[PDB]
Amino acid sequence: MHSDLTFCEIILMEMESHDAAWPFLEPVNPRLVSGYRRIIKNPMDFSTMRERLLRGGYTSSEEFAADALLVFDNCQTFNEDDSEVGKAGHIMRRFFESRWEEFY
Ligand SMILES: NC(=O)c1cc(OC2CCNCC2)ccn1
């Protein structure tokens, strides 16, 4: 309900300020990341999710979690599990999955 979206605000704020958030704060600039345009067919990042959440672009917490899990699916698609970005994506994905279950 109304709490459906105040939930997402808590988690997105906590993800935005997380230590391991840096690879996901703003969209990937494909000019600087070769191959990213070819490989990732639906880029997503925390700032895009913030924009959408601010303008009411989510009708439920489900669609919010869809965008979050898309951030981490793209991360694992593009980065090796032992790359620096990959390690941060695993730390972030486990955080998100945890906090998400601590409400639902
Ligand atoms: N969130 C991401 O997927 C992501 C990928 C990325 O690619 C870079 C990673 C470092 N070496 C060159 C390519 C850089 C930042 N972030």
Numbering used by the authors: 1795 to 1898
Sentences from the paper on this structure:
BAZ2A is an epigenetic regulator affecting transcription of ribosomal RNA. It is overexpressed in aggressive and recurrent prostate cancer, promoting cellular migration.
Consequently, the charged piperidine is not directed toward Glu1820 but rather exposed to the solvent. The amide of compound 13 does not reciprocally interact with the side chain of Asn1823, unusually placing the amide nitrogen in the small pocket reserved for the KAc methyl group in physiological ligands.
